[PDB]
Design an enzyme around this catalytic site. Structure first.
Site, PDB file in Angstrom:
ATOM      1  CD  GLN A 172      61.751  14.848  35.883  1.00  0.00           C
ATOM      2  OE1 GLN A 172      61.475  13.899  35.111  1.00  0.00           O
ATOM      3  NE2 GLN A 172      60.902  15.844  36.156  1.00  0.00           N
ATOM      4  CG  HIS A 194      62.236  14.846  40.146  1.00  0.00           C
ATOM      5  ND1 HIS A 194      61.559  13.790  40.729  1.00  0.00           N
ATOM      6  CD2 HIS A 194      61.293  15.762  39.803  1.00  0.00           C
ATOM      7  CE1 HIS A 194      60.261  14.053  40.721  1.00  0.00           C
ATOM      8  NE2 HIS A 194      60.067  15.241  40.167  1.00  0.00           N
ATOM      9  CG  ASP A 238      58.352  16.757  42.858  1.00  0.00           C
ATOM     10  OD1 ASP A 238      57.600  16.927  43.863  1.00  0.00           O
ATOM     11  OD2 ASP A 238      57.831  16.787  41.715  1.00  0.00           O
ATOM     12  CD  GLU A 273      58.299  19.696  40.841  1.00  0.00           C
ATOM     13  OE1 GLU A 273      59.421  19.791  40.306  1.00  0.00           O
ATOM     14  OE2 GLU A 273      57.339  19.050  40.340  1.00  0.00           O
ATOM     15  CG  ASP A 307      53.910  19.369  39.969  1.00  0.00           C
ATOM     16  OD1 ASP A 307      52.869  19.409  39.240  1.00  0.00           O
ATOM     17  OD2 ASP A 307      54.607  18.303  40.001  1.00  0.00           O
ATOM     18  CD  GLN A 329      56.512  20.357  36.503  1.00  0.00           C
ATOM     19  OE1 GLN A 329      56.351  19.456  35.693  1.00  0.00           O
ATOM     20  NE2 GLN A 329      56.624  20.142  37.793  1.00  0.00           N
ATOM     21  CE  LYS A 331      52.055  20.769  36.618  1.00  0.00           C
ATOM     22  NZ  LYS A 331      50.980  20.424  37.593  1.00  0.00           N
ATOM     23  CB  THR A 360      56.067  13.673  30.024  1.00  0.00           C
ATOM     24  OG1 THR A 360      55.946  12.271  30.343  1.00  0.00           O
ATOM     25  CG2 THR A 360      55.769  13.784  28.504  1.00  0.00           C
ATOM     26  CB  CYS A 361      60.039  10.178  31.286  1.00  0.00           C
ATOM     27  SG  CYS A 361      58.706   9.432  32.185  1.00  0.00           S
TER      28      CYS A 361
HETATM   29 MG    MG Z   1      56.268  17.557  40.945  1.00  0.00          MG
END
Ligand code: MG
Ligand code: MG
EC number: 4.3.1.2
Lengths: 413, 413
Positions: A172, A194, A238, A273, A307, A329, A331, A360-361
């Site tokens: 991403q 992304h 996305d 996305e 998403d 996705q 999560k 997640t980042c």
């Molecule tokens: Mg998204």
């Protein structure tokens, strides 16, 4: 084998906790910080260090199982559990969970993970981040007791008889959608980038013109920079519901636009996305379903990734059951127990839906290793490079784990 | 306990291999990449992915020890071993080292690491990066066999009787010495921010005026952004010999300037890395020694950190014996065997010289965990947050590891 001790330590993550509500009310972006008053409970600054809790389970033989509790960047935001500060949640683990773990026999992962995922304290469910970390540690404890990889445990318990192989890695870019792409090409990301297309006029274009130029740019950039001519990654962009907004959720118009995007991406395949983001889960499902139906009917080989509105395991099954997109996705941090990851992926697999094992980042190196194992075990369609926004670090963590796992599995193949 | 199998897998790192020679000749910029022909043998592009090799030692009890081979960003540059491509070096390990490991009983770390550090193939020493990885793996194996942390192994073998405590973590900013500073303050780095002051005119200032303003800026930024009042990090700025250049290596003029920097940093303490960079090792030792002598003589509480010309264990001893600076950078990937890191740190300590347990942005998450254990064991003055340039990811990896290690050792106090 039993657990003989439980230790928790506070930690950092790959990113930050941000008070999204405050940012929306006008917080000042200044360098890498935000100035101004907070709005969300628990925050003392608008941007604060992300936090983790490392959960270590000491086994009778002296091995130490390790998982990390972590939450999303917008911890405490709408529909999320409270801001995940280690100092607030360490005591909960130490007082309420550790005593149920110490002395516990390590058997199979599934029943143990489900027990802790559903455990309540004072009749309330545990913070998602705690469930995330504790179940990761339990997975590692079972793997260490059996002397196999975490992936092998999950495969055995959720995907029996399957091979464990590599899974494409998705990187991403954030807003730096040009230079981070260069990184991705050099590091040979399998899926990218992304691109954070989160504004209609500025990023998509009113009628999609800017994104069309971006796809062209990305196509040509890959061709220009790739070290080998056979490097042919998949595009995954996305759009945060902007295609729906630009085209008034008109199924035909959206399909026409996406078709032009796929034509521009050639010879690379395209995944979009969140094409639309409408007003309730039911209508999100319908719009994804119908947009997929239209693209498929046309023979346009572009995929849609769900998403927005698709959050829980029950949601995943709902979107799957209605063919609402081509890929869903999963999560990871939001699902709590990592056993839920495996159940969600397996449901998609059993029902012909692609599964994108996300993340997640703002999680950690350890949580990324753990969820990468699960993704491999369940045959996910892609896994996210994570955590952090540096790109390099997340790709390293996930890909290096993947390779080592494959080598170890290969000894018992 | 014996080693029963050895597996090697290729991997990524926190950064890139760059052809320093081609960059010095004038390679141009194109987004995140460099343009033009390569100059250094082995490169196919001026900037290419950094590479690692994961070395896995499977133990008789089924546990798996893991170290990562890695090299610096400027792999294959002047004075360095060849460009560290996994495909070129995996066969060396598989064919020449693995057979010497398989079947070996695991005893103490020190003799085994020294054996592997010094091992030759066809009469030649092994690449530094292979030695780095293999010895990391050996350390992990001893730890796993003894059921204690890697830090404890090193402590017992090199620093017997000592307490294992947290070590200040240093973070490096790269050229973005403003925004990455914010990251460091938010993540609470103990030492910061390197700042890459590598040009006289543009970064130091002809008479040091720009760096003086930067010190004042940093001081004020910390005070503005810190979450807690007692957050008081140490400043560490690398000037790449530019102070020497700006002031013609005049001891008195350099000292006067550094004294102004220290006054401007108050209330924070200042360390200056590489004040001068002169024509040979002897003259570099002499200039560092005499500049320190002058500052100490004036009672200026600022420290000098050695780097240029101080590379090998022999060099570290030489700079230490001659008080050539207040702290020496122990260049982890460049010393080959990680046993050399411990020996270098311990020598510094015995001789009252500060030891900065370094590293590279181009190594891995695992190599960072291992060297962080070594730094803690030996009581280094600081350890580097690494790898990568994202800052967040390196801080997480190193600090999370430090916290977990401390908790595990605490069970055996
Ligand atoms: Mg998204
Ligand atoms: Mg330096």
């Amino acid at each position: 084998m039993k657990i003989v001790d439980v230790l928790c330590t506070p930690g950092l993550t790959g990113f930050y906790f941000d008070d999204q509500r405050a940012i929306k009310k006008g917080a000042g972006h200044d360098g890498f910080t935000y100035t101004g008053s907070t709005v969300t409970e628990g925050f003392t600054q608008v941007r604060q260090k992300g936090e983790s809790i490392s959960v270590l389970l000491v086994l009778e033989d002296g091995q130490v199982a390790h998982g990390d509790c972590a939450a999303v960047q917008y911890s405490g935001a709408g529909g999320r559990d409270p801001l995940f500060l280690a100092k607030d949640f360490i005591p909960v683990i130490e007082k309420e969970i550790a005593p149920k773990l110490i002395g516990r026999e390590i058997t199979n992962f599934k029943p143990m993970a489900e027990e802790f995922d559903k455990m309540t304290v004072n009749g309330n469910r545990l913070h998602t981040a705690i469930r995330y970390g504790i179940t990761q540690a339990i997975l590692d404890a079972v793997a260490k007791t059996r002397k196999v990889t975490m992936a092998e445990v999950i495969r055995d318990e959720y995907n029996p008889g399957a091979e464990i192989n590599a899974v494409p890695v998705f990187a991403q870019s954030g807003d730096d959608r040009y230079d981070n792409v260069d990184k991705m090409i050099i590091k040979e990301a399998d899926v990218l980038p992304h691109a954070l297309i989160n504004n209609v006029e500025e990023k998509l274009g009113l009628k999609g013109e800017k994104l069309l130029e971006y796809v062209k740019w990305l196509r040509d950039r890959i061709i220009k920079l790739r070290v080998r001519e056979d490097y042919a990654p998949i595009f995954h962009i996305d759009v945060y519901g902007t295609i729906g907004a630009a085209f008034d959720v008109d199924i035909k118009a959206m399909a026409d636009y996406i078709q032009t995007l796929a034509e521009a991406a050639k010879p690379f395949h395209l995944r979009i996305e969140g094409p639309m983001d409408v007003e309730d889960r039911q209508k999100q499902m319908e719009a994804m379903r119908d947009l997929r139906a239209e693209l498929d009917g046309r023979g346009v080989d572009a995929e849609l990734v769900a998403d927005e509105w698709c959050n829980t395991v029950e949601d995943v099954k709902f979107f799957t059951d209605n063919k609402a997109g081509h890929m869903v996705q999963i999560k990871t941090p939001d699902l709590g127990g990592v056993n839920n990851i495996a159940d969600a992926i397996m449901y998609c697999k059993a029902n012909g839906m692609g599964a994108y094992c996300g993340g997640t980042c703002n999680e950690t190196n350890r949580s990324a290793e753990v969820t990468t194992n699960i993704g491999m075990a369940c045959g996910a369609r892609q896994v996210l490079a994570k955590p952090g926004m540096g790109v390099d670090e997340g790709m390293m963590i996930v890909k290096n784990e993947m390779n080592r796992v494959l080598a170890l599995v290969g000894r018992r193949k």
